From a paper:
In this study, a PETase-like enzyme (PETase SM14) from Streptomyces sp. SM14 was heterologously produced in Escherichia coli, and its activity was tested on post-consumer plastic substrates using high-performance liquid chromatography for product quantification as well as scanning electron microscopy and atomic force microscopy for substrate surface imaging evaluation. PETase SM14 exhibited high salt tolerance (1.5 M), good heat resistance (Tm 56.26 °C), and optimal activity at pH 9.0, highlighting its potential for PET waste bioremediation. All three enzymes share conserved motifs, including the serine hydrolase sequence Gly-x1-Ser-x2-Gly and the catalytic triad Ser-Asp-His. Due to its thermostability and activity on PCP, PETase SM14 may represent an interesting tool for enzymatic PET waste management.
Furthermore, its X-ray crystal structure was solved at 1.43 Å resolution, revealing conserved features of the PETase family with potential relevance for future engineering applications. The X-ray structure of PETase SM14 (UniProt ID: A0A679PDB4) validated the accuracy of the predicted AlphaFold structure, exhibiting a high structural identity with a root-mean-square deviation (RMSD) of 0.278 Å. Notably, this extends to the loop regions, where the catalytic site is located. Structural alignment of the three enzymes shows a high degree of similarity, with an RMSD of 0.691 Å across 190 Cα atoms for IsPETase and an RMSD of 0.81 Å over 195 Cα atoms for PE-H including the catalytic triad within the active site pocket. The catalytic triad of PETase SM14 (blue sticks) comprises S156, D202, and H234, while that of IsPETase (green sticks) includes S160, D206, and H237 and S171, D217, and H249 for PE-H from P. aestusnigri (pink sticks). While the catalytic residues align across all three, the catalytic pocket appears more closed in PE-H and SM14 compared to that in IsPETase. For instance, Y88 and F98 in PETase SM14 and PE-H, respectively, are positioned in such a way that the catalytic pocket appears to be more closed. Structural alignment enabled the identification of the corresponding residues of PETase SM14 and PE-H, which have a nearly identical arrangement: Y88, H155, M157, W181, I204 and F98, W170, M172, W195, and I219. In PETase SM14, however, the motif includes a histidine (H155), instead of a tryptophan (W159), which is commonly found in IsPETase and related hydrolases, ,, also in PE-H (W170). IsPETase features a highly polarized surface charge, resulting in an isoelectric point (pI) of 9.41, whereas PETase SM14 and PE-H have a theoretical pI of 6.67 and 6.54, respectively (as determined by the ExPASy, ProtParam tool), and both exhibit a less polarized and more delocalized surface charge.
Numbering used by the authors: 26 to 284
The structure:
Amino acid sequence: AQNPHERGPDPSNSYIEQARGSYSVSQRSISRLGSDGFRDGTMYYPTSTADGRFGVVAISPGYTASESTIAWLGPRLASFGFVVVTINTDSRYDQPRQRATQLHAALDHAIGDSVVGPRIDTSRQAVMGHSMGGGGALQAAEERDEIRAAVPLTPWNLKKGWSGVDAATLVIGAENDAIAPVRSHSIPFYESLTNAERRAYLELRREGHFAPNSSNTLIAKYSVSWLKRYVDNDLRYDQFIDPGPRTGITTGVSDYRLG
């Protein structure tokens, strides 16, 4: 490809829905000191070195703070061609700003790791997170220019104005969310991402706050597509983002916007 960062097969709808993509995944534990709330976690990455370095995606855990809440994302997204760091934390670190701190640390930990560091293109970083972890993803994106993509999942944040984010951002809301209602969290965030390279809002029909903590084909396929497109500049994934899913019972999508 003209594009040096293209990894893996030409995609299809079936492909991006797979539990695992083309790449076999290895994993390596994280053990670190400090008081930021991130003392452990996991790095998932393609074993194969044949294709070049990959971007790195850090994921902030969910509402209840354990890594287990986001663990399914790690090997699944990594298998499409990413280094993926899942953070473990606890309830002392529930502020989005505290979660942002950890995301920067997780990206830096993987970059600086003797095993995984050589597999990362440090110019191509990304963040995701659930709940306040999704709020923290927005904040980390505002703070780190090397973040090329953000995918907040049912994000919670009292801060509503995201003009400071340049990273392409896909906000995934849950229609029936009673913790971070879309009307006061996700959609205001989408509406204020006025400087994001691209912004998208994808609402999960008839789901609530905790949907992102279980394997979710919608979250996975659109996360894969967004990360591919903005972390890898991979135009092969535009076909899934625009026009995107139609809404209704048959797609499980209650709202989809691009801007």
